Paper text:
Ribosomes are conserved in all kingdoms of life: they are composed of rRNA and proteins unequally distributed among two asymmetric subunits (small and large subunits, 30S and 50S, respectively in bacteria).
The second K+ ion interacts with the [name] in the A-site and helps orienting the third codon base for proper base pairing with anticodon residue 34 (consequently, it was identified only in the EC). In our structure of the EC, we have localized a K+ ion in the P/E kink, which appears to be coordinated through its solvent shell according to the distances in the pocket. Previously, this ion, which participates in the network of contacts formed between the ms2i6A37 modification in the P site tRNAPhe and ribosomal elements surrounding the [name] P/E kink, resulting in the anchoring of P-site tRNA, was assigned as magnesium. Regarding the A/P kink region, we have observed additional electron density in the EC only, where [name] is locked in its position upon the binding of A-tRNA. In the EC, two Mg2+ and three K+ ions stabilize the P-tRNA, while three Mg2+ ions are found in the IC.
Numbering used by the authors:
A (entry chain P8): 1 to 49
B (entry chain 11): 2 to 273
RNA sequence: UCGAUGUCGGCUCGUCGCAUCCUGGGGCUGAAGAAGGUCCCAAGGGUUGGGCUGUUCGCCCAUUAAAGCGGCACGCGAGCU
RNA sequence: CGAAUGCCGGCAUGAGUAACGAUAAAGAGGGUGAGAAUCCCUCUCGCCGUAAGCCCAAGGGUUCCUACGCAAUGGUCGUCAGCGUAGGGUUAGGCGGGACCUAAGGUGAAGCCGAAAGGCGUAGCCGAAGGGCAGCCGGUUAAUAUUCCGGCCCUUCCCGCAGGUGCGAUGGGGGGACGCUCUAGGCUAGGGGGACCGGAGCCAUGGACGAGCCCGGCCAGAAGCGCAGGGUGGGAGGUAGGCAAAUCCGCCUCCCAACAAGCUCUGCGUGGUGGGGAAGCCCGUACGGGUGACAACCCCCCGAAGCCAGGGAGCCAAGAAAAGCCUCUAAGCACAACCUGCGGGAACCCGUACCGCAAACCGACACAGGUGGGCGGGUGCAAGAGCACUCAGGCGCGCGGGAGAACCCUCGCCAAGGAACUCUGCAAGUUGGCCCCGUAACUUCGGGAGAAGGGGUGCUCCCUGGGGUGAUGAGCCCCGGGGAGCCGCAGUGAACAGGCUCUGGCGACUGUUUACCAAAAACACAGCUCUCUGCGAACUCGUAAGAGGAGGUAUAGGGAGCGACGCUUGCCCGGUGCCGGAAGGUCAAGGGGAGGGGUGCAAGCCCCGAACCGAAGCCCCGGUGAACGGCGGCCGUAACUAUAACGGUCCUAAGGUAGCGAAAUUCCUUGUCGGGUAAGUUCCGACCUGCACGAAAAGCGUAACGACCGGAGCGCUGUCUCGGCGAGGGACCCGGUGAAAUUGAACUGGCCGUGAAGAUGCGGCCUACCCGUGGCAGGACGAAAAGACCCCGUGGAGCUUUACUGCAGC
RNA sequence: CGAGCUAGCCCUGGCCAGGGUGAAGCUGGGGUGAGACCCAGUGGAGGCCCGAACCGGUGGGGGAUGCAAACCCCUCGGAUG
RNA sequence: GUGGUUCGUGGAGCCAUGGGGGAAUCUGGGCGGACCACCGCCUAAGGCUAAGUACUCCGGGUGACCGAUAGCGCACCAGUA
RNA sequence: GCCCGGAUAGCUCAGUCGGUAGAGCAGGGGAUUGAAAAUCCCCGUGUCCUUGGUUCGAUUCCGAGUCCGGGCACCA
RNA sequence: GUGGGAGAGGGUGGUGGAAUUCCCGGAGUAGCGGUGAAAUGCGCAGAUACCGGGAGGAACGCCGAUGGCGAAGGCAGCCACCUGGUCCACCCGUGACGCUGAGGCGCGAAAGCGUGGGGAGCAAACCGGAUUAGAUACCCGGGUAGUCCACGCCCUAAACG
């Protein structure tokens, strides 16, 4: 069947992007937290070009 | 005069389409159409505030003139009569003698060619619009304003009309399409005649799909749901209503009056 | 037996009991004969095909020597339905 | 620490077991190499070909090319690889995106709201597979190419010349600019044919040296020329409209012009010149080169769904915006500027490899699943993207060799019977296409209908009527019609392609649903009724702002029920709801204070507090049924009996009308009778005793519809009597690779007993040499899931309401 | 934190081989005082019919430590809405 | 009308304050738990003020703290694969 | 089988605080009519279902029993 | 043909006043309705009765007749328009063009039916109050469809002279 993961580089960044996080205050904590923990990447890795 | 079909398909048996004879122009007057944002019944939150709405043919708003007095005393020539899919009534394209083109909602009778004008002067003739006070008692009238300069808001739907019944100071006694006896201010304009396309109430959509063309998605009965969803949800088979009939939001719905009592316009109503 | 012993009926495959439905042997008879009745011995084998109903059962159709009754987790769903 | 279905890790059992991932299929020769069924190469064979081929997009991200490699990854093998190591590889003014436009939506000066966080929001801005905008054909690389090179052709910016002209905006106006169905003309893509042009060659096996077979016979191309087609009236006066101003647009009145023309614009043909250029044969390539050659390069036919394109007609459900563009005037400027030519110059950022219906994307896998757009040849079959074969191209599915059991699966045949099978014709058969003939009840007149049932169907020769293209002619096509005959068991000779009828129930209908056990009689549905709602509508979301409703206005909008259509839809308003009642009772805060109280020496200060004045609500009075709802008992009575039209009485708000009725409702019940059958718990017609139908939770019907559910018949059949044979894929044997749940430990027999009540394990007896392989499933109360039923728990959740208490709302 | 699955709506695009059936309207003829209507031709409508793509998921078999955590084969429903 | 305080409406004062009403400048005002008298205590409706207190991302010193299944999740290129 | 209710004149039914029980209809006797009906006048019979108990006394209170009617007979 | 009549003949569009009902206003008090007698019903929540203002529908008193017109069914306030038949006068015109009429076709009261609209009075059905032995009737209080309009059906009649 059609599974649940249907990759879309624009959707990925529109939705989990750095800019996206910094808009909502909930998102800035999501960042606040991933930094305070050491995550190597704060937002998912995407690829425009 | 309404079109019928031979029964060459189930649902053509009963389908009925408006006779489009009084229609004169077919594409609309470009300088007078906006795109209208179709809601699907959704408010500015992304949330349905009106159920079962959406789909339905793409449409182009015709910006129509409901304040007639912003051109007092300039006559116009009825240029066309054309289909407007944003209302039940058909619109008349008119051509003002100073060259302005404007859209009127077409009264019954009004034919391609005649003169129309609005103002205190304004011969008492179908198409002309006057402050109510200068309209002969008993004339039938349409596109009334409720308050002066706020624009026509009354008796605009196909075949509707109000009747001027009397006067009391600044307010004339109007009989609305709904039989109700409202006082309306005298300086309220109203174009004379009734609305026409009166057969409107006789089309028979004929099949589920015709509703769909008009933006009307299916409507599911409380009965048909479960109790999370609706007061009439549930039961084993089929269920009598079981309680005073109600809405999904739970309020009574056979009789229960909702107009607010304290409402200041109470003062200017006298009917039902 | 509830940290699970799948439950009616059909199918298939049986096997055992005998309080015997047939066949075999018998005593009595209100047994002339022929056909029965009743009770005794006997479980070696045999004990049909259909209509109806999920039915077991049952009732009917047409036969038959007969169209037996029970047990096996109301035998059998790691065999099927 | 021995147990916690404990936790982590290790290693066992099942076991050399099941499996090795589409039954498209393989064989050999040669080569490489330590080693080859698995890598290279040739020959043969098979498979795809509306693809299993080719090109975009998204995704992925070096997988691409090459060299050197095989530990691991690869379901076997590996010399190979999408693997390892290294090196190389992606070139643009014109392709795509960005230095352009706007869409939904997002964001958001102003401004509005909100304890905070934040929510809204006209403009503006952002946002594209939509608008706009300038590159075609070849060649070249191991690997990029509309990007590099060749030929031919364009765009914009800057600066010049020259020639024009009141220039000039982010402002005005035009345009851009729009649906669905059907569709004319003329082309193009693409194809088929040729006796014509070109070409290596060929003559086999009986025949053929032939107008033989085989192969090919084009592509791009500015200007100008044609052929098609699109778009567009020309002038003059008036002017208050298009939020300033217009000379523009709009409106008005003149004139000429008008199914055209002329001006434009596009497509197509041609066109300077440029490119390409087969089969075959020989080259050593994993594949490309040479030649074929001075290649030829023409004619005819078919012909798009594409192009001219903003074409045309019909229709109703009534079909984006903004820029580019053209016009118009404002400031400002007019020794500016713009427009037009022609010249030089300038022309950036990002993408570009590879996979891309799949071993590179989504599915943990080199997974039989999923994945959007374009191209998709030929011949035949009525047509077609269908079906069979097949071209280009691509592939044989990354374990094989044998064998010839059961059994399983997929498949083919079956004597006689023909549903006897069974819950049920489940399944499988039969039927199948096109042409013609023919076709019932019933009907809403359309239908039912492909009803049913039949006849025909190939090939050969002769005759012969129309179309299209040519020219009215030949040729090439297309639609045919007549007559003679030929061969088979069979002519839709393969492949694709309804079994039919009669009679019920339910739902009118097409649709819709429980992703993943229910597709339905359920939901929806046109339509009908009721009700709210006068517009800052009601209703809905939100604390609010706001917003939907709706840029709508009672022929409209919300809510509820019913559910095409026909004929209908009875009585009850006592209770509950809703509606109406400016009186009366009651009634909270408040008012009002008769009258008391506490304290002070008092003036005070401070408490209670009776009338009475106090809303909504409740009571009360009425209405109200397509509002919640409800819709009786007993006894008697007719001149044979039976039965009761009739009577008597208790009770009720009122006592069930038409229709229908053992029913999707009937308990007794397989009711009784009739029909079908040899036989009928079913089915159909009836009867009425309706356990416990009955009128919009509609009643009774209804043509048509149905993957619904029922009964029957005909046709046909391996469903069956009742099985047999056969094919292939497994199973089996050998070689390679090698799991799984489960498992206290095991040296793990039968009976009759016994035992916590169903024993391999206890007693007694009986049987029994050790160990395996293929098989079958009776038992290990076999596995699997801490039973899903049941109960328990002062465990939980969803849901109801005249349960309690509250909160929103009113 | 999620609508990259799924549900609905909004914007903008695309898709649906080929056959059948033959509504209205037209046009002619008839008819009539005029009409209605009737017949033919044209026409080409439809939640119309057959059938691929595409969308489905009826019945059956198979699969059931699967090719597959919903697949496969035969069969069937829609296929201009 | 509420909150805070031990104070859950209680005899419910004190502090605070959403609503209503609404003063005075020392002979003014608040307080001592309803209220009154008395006797006291304070000086509302402006603001600032180190230290003594809290914490450990960081540096150091200790340990009847661990010792690679322990000790931080991480002793190792771990908030990684 | 399990619980509720009822049993009063010939029929259909009120009714009781424990003591002398009524309503309609039927029936009976009179009247009215030519005769019947309707109308009118006058007239109850009741062992208050059976049985046992409580009482001074029971149709009345209590326990059982018949009988009738109503609800129930669920998971299984 | 020519000139003229009379007419509720038909169709359309308007328009008038009386009255009924409802609504608003005013003034007023206990009854009003109704019948054979009653009751139901309405009324101090202010009814009946009276005045004023309005709304709406249907029917047209007197004239009015045993009258008129029409083929019939039928037609009645008034005004206009459109329109049928008829009668008389005059003796002009055609020249037997006449009569009837199976079928056909058209009109056709009331009730009824469809789709809309309208709805004051009236009133099948229906509800109450009475009467009766009963009363599913007659009398009374209410009351729906219908009655009215438009279009389209139905086609009956003591459609009778
Ligand atoms: K519905
Ligand atoms: K239900
Ligand atoms: K157990
Ligand atoms: K158990
Ligand atoms: K014997
Ligand atoms: K025997
Ligand atoms: K039975
Ligand atoms: K058992
Ligand atoms: K089973
Ligand atoms: K079984
Ligand atoms: K077992
Ligand atoms: K353990
Ligand atoms: K092993
Ligand atoms: K295989
Ligand atoms: K092909
Ligand atoms: K290897
Ligand atoms: K593998
Ligand atoms: K090697
Ligand atoms: K774009
Ligand atoms: K401009
Ligand atoms: K514009
Ligand atoms: K070509
Ligand atoms: K490239
Ligand atoms: K073998
Ligand atoms: K059988
Ligand atoms: K020809
Ligand atoms: K077929
Ligand atoms: K029905
Ligand atoms: K699921
Ligand atoms: K279906
Ligand atoms: K459903
Ligand atoms: K709006
Ligand atoms: K009621
Ligand atoms: K009520
Ligand atoms: K009432
Ligand atoms: K019955
Ligand atoms: K029943
Ligand atoms: K029978
Ligand atoms: K179905
Ligand atoms: K076993
Ligand atoms: K409890
Ligand atoms: K036609
Ligand atoms: K068609
Ligand atoms: K306190
Ligand atoms: K204070
Ligand atoms: K104090
Ligand atoms: K103090
Ligand atoms: K401080
Ligand atoms: K370790
Ligand atoms: K760890
Ligand atoms: K009683
Ligand atoms: K009595
Ligand atoms: K009488
Ligand atoms: K009346
Ligand atoms: K009425
Ligand atoms: K008459
Ligand atoms: K008469
Ligand atoms: Mg996943
Ligand atoms: Mg880093
Ligand atoms: Mg526009
Ligand atoms: Mg939002
Ligand atoms: Mg439901
Ligand atoms: Mg929910
Ligand atoms: Mg609820
Ligand atoms: Mg309910
Ligand atoms: Mg349910
Ligand atoms: Mg039910
Ligand atoms: Mg209303
Ligand atoms: Mg166990
Ligand atoms: Mg014996
Ligand atoms: Mg004898
Ligand atoms: Mg035996
Ligand atoms: Mg035996
Ligand atoms: Mg038998
Ligand atoms: Mg038993
Ligand atoms: Mg037993
Ligand atoms: Mg059993
Ligand atoms: Mg078993
Ligand atoms: Mg252990
Ligand atoms: Mg280890
Ligand atoms: Mg380890
Ligand atoms: Mg084994
Ligand atoms: Mg084995
Ligand atoms: Mg094997
Ligand atoms: Mg080989
Ligand atoms: Mg080899
Ligand atoms: Mg092939
Ligand atoms: Mg194919
Ligand atoms: Mg491929
Ligand atoms: Mg990419
Ligand atoms: Mg990947
Ligand atoms: Mg490679
Ligand atoms: Mg290997
Ligand atoms: Mg490769
Ligand atoms: Mg590599
Ligand atoms: Mg660009
Ligand atoms: Mg720049
Ligand atoms: Mg923009
Ligand atoms: Mg915002
Ligand atoms: Mg574009
Ligand atoms: Mg471009
Ligand atoms: Mg190239
Ligand atoms: Mg390449
Ligand atoms: Mg190229
Ligand atoms: Mg200019
Ligand atoms: Mg064409
Ligand atoms: Mg070309
Ligand atoms: Mg061809
Ligand atoms: Mg050729
Ligand atoms: Mg040569
Ligand atoms: Mg030879
Ligand atoms: Mg030769
Ligand atoms: Mg030759
Ligand atoms: Mg050319
Ligand atoms: Mg060209
Ligand atoms: Mg002009
Ligand atoms: Mg001018
Ligand atoms: Mg201006
Ligand atoms: Mg032209
Ligand atoms: Mg050469
Ligand atoms: Mg067009
Ligand atoms: Mg802009
Ligand atoms: Mg590429
Ligand atoms: Mg490939
Ligand atoms: Mg590719
Ligand atoms: Mg593709
Ligand atoms: Mg590949
Ligand atoms: Mg591939
Ligand atoms: Mg491929
Ligand atoms: Mg593979
Ligand atoms: Mg795959
Ligand atoms: Mg994969
Ligand atoms: Mg092809
Ligand atoms: Mg093609
Ligand atoms: Mg083909
Ligand atoms: Mg074919
Ligand atoms: Mg090949
Ligand atoms: Mg394959
Ligand atoms: Mg394989
Ligand atoms: Mg056979
Ligand atoms: Mg045979
Ligand atoms: Mg037969
Ligand atoms: Mg049978
Ligand atoms: Mg079948
Ligand atoms: Mg076939
Ligand atoms: Mg028939
Ligand atoms: Mg037919
Ligand atoms: Mg046929
Ligand atoms: Mg046929
Ligand atoms: Mg033949
Ligand atoms: Mg032949
Ligand atoms: Mg039945
Ligand atoms: Mg249906
Ligand atoms: Mg269909
Ligand atoms: Mg369907
Ligand atoms: Mg499901
Ligand atoms: Mg489910
Ligand atoms: Mg679905
Ligand atoms: Mg599920
Ligand atoms: Mg299923
Ligand atoms: Mg299903
Ligand atoms: Mg709004
Ligand atoms: Mg509505
Ligand atoms: Mg609605
Ligand atoms: Mg329903
Ligand atoms: Mg009320
Ligand atoms: Mg009061
Ligand atoms: Mg008070
Ligand atoms: Mg007070
Ligand atoms: Mg009150
Ligand atoms: Mg009441
Ligand atoms: Mg009803
Ligand atoms: Mg029978
Ligand atoms: Mg049966
Ligand atoms: Mg019912
Ligand atoms: Mg009902
Ligand atoms: Mg129904
Ligand atoms: Mg029925
Ligand atoms: Mg039917
Ligand atoms: Mg068989
Ligand atoms: Mg076999
Ligand atoms: Mg085989
Ligand atoms: Mg083996
Ligand atoms: Mg092996
Ligand atoms: Mg385990
Ligand atoms: Mg034992
Ligand atoms: Mg022992
Ligand atoms: Mg032992
Ligand atoms: Mg074995
Ligand atoms: Mg077990
Ligand atoms: Mg348990
Ligand atoms: Mg469990
Ligand atoms: Mg469950
Ligand atoms: Mg509990
Ligand atoms: Mg609990
Ligand atoms: Mg989505
Ligand atoms: Mg979505
Ligand atoms: Mg269709
Ligand atoms: Mg396609
Ligand atoms: Mg697809
Ligand atoms: Mg799909
Ligand atoms: Mg399936
Ligand atoms: Mg299965
Ligand atoms: Mg299909
Ligand atoms: Mg189809
Ligand atoms: Mg659509
Ligand atoms: Mg407190
Ligand atoms: Mg307390
Ligand atoms: Mg104080
Ligand atoms: Mg104090
Ligand atoms: Mg004190
Ligand atoms: Mg140490
Ligand atoms: Mg550690
Ligand atoms: Mg260690
Ligand atoms: Mg570690
Ligand atoms: Mg009695
Ligand atoms: Mg006694
Ligand atoms: Mg007259
Ligand atoms: Mg008249
Ligand atoms: Mg009054
Ligand atoms: Mg006249
Ligand atoms: Mg004469
Ligand atoms: Mg003469
Ligand atoms: Mg009539
Ligand atoms: Mg009538
Ligand atoms: Mg009506």
């Amino acid at each position: 069947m059609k599974r649940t993961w249907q990759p879309n580089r624009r959707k990925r960044a529109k939705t989990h992007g750095f800019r996206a996080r910094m808009r909502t205050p909930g998102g800035r904590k999501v960042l606040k937290r991933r930094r305070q923990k050491g995550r190597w990447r704060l937002t998912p890795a995407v690829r425009k070009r | 005069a309404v079109k019928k079909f031979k029964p060459y398909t189930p649902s053509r048996r009963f389908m009925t389409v408006a006779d489009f004879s009084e229609i004169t122009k077919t594409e609309p007057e470009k300088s007078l159409v906006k795109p209208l944002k179709k809601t699907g019944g959704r408010n500015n939150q992304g949330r349905i505030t009106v159920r079962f709405r959406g789909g339905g043919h793409k449409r182009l708003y015709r910006i129509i003139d409901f304040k007639r007095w912003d051109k007092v005393g300039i006559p116009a020539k009825v240029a066309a009569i054309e289909y407007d899919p944003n209302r039940s009534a058909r619109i008349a394209l008119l051509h003002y003698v100073d060259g302005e083109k404007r859209y009127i909602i077409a009264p019954d009778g009004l034919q391609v060619g005649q003169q129309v004008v609005a103002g205190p002067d304004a011969p008492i003739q179908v198409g002309n619009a006057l402050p109510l006070r200068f309209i002969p008692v008993g004339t039938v009238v349409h596109a009334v304003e409720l308050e002066p300069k706020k624009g026509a808001k009354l008796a605009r739907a196909a075949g509707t009309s109000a009747q001027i019944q009397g006067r009391e100071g600044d307010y004339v006694i109007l009989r609305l399409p709904s039989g109700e006896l409202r006082k309306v201010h005298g300086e309220c304009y109203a174009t004379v005649g009734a609305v026409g396309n009166a057969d409107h109430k006789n089309i028979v959509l004929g099949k589920a799909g015709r509703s769909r063309w008009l933006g009307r998605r299916p409507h599911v009965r409380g009965a048909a749901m479960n109790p999370v969803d609706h007061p009439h949800g549930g039961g084993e088979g089929r269920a009598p209503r079981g309680r005073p009939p109600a809405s999904p939001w739970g309020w009574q719905t056979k009789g229960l009056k909702t107009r607010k009592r304290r409402k200041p316009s109470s003062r200017f109503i006298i009917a039902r």
